[PDB]
Design a protein around this ligand. Structure first.
Ligand code: AMP
Ligand code: MG
Length: 177
């Protein structure tokens, strides 16, 4: 009763999500059949981006199209150009957003992300599988039920992993970037 994380991924995520995630892994020479906890994390983070998004999706795009979209927004608006390539753009609050989904402590992950991107303008919003969240300046952007729907989906993933004996490994395998 330990299942295959690959089979879980292909069965419990939307195929559009799985295909984007495989595309993203193959781009970096990681194999979805091998690095399966990573495959699941990737799909989960994609699904959160899509649920969160008013918003232009950046994550999930081919890197040349993602930078085209970033540059196009930056040279249309005032906005500072990110050094990395965020997840979303918010046309309302006029800023890029980095979304994180973590199996570690949310403050730890948040500050890792803040330290990587070194931006005063890009908003960071971190979700955990425990239902904890942390967002830049305690500005949460979306309303309560929209964030609750994201947390609920995270719990559903976790329980469905547990059901297959996949949670233990998945939850223990996250490293710093
Ligand atoms: N569409 C995607 N393309 C590449 N990596 C992704 C995608 N969705 C999720 N991920 C993974 O989920 C997190 C996304 O990276 P970041 O956008 O820096 O939080 C990292 O764990 C990524 O490797
Ligand atoms: Mg991203």
């Amino acid at each position: 009763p330990l299942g295959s994380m690959e089979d879980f991924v292909r069965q419990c995520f939307n195929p559009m999500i799985v295909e984007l995630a495989e595309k993203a892994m193959k781009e970096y020479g990681e194999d979805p059949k091998i690095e399966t906890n990573k495959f699941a994390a990737i799909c989960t983070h994609l699904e959160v981006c899509f649920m969160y998004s008013r918003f232009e999706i950046i994550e999930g795009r081919d890197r040349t199209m993602a930078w085209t979209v970033v540059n196009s927004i930056c040279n249309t608006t005032g906005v500072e150009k990110p050094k990395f390539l965020p997840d979303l753009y918010d046309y309302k609050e006029n800023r890029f957003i980095e979304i994180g989904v973590t199996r570690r402590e949310v403050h730890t992950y948040y500050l890792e992300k803040a330290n990587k991107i070194k931006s005063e303008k890009t908003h960071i919003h971190i979700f955990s599988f425990t239902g904890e969240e942390m967002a830049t300046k305690a500005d949460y952007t979306l309303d309560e039920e929209s964030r609750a729907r994201i947390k609920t989906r995270l719990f559903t993933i976790r329980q469905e992993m547990a059901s297959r004996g996949l949670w233990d490994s998945f939850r223990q395998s996250e490293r710093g970037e």
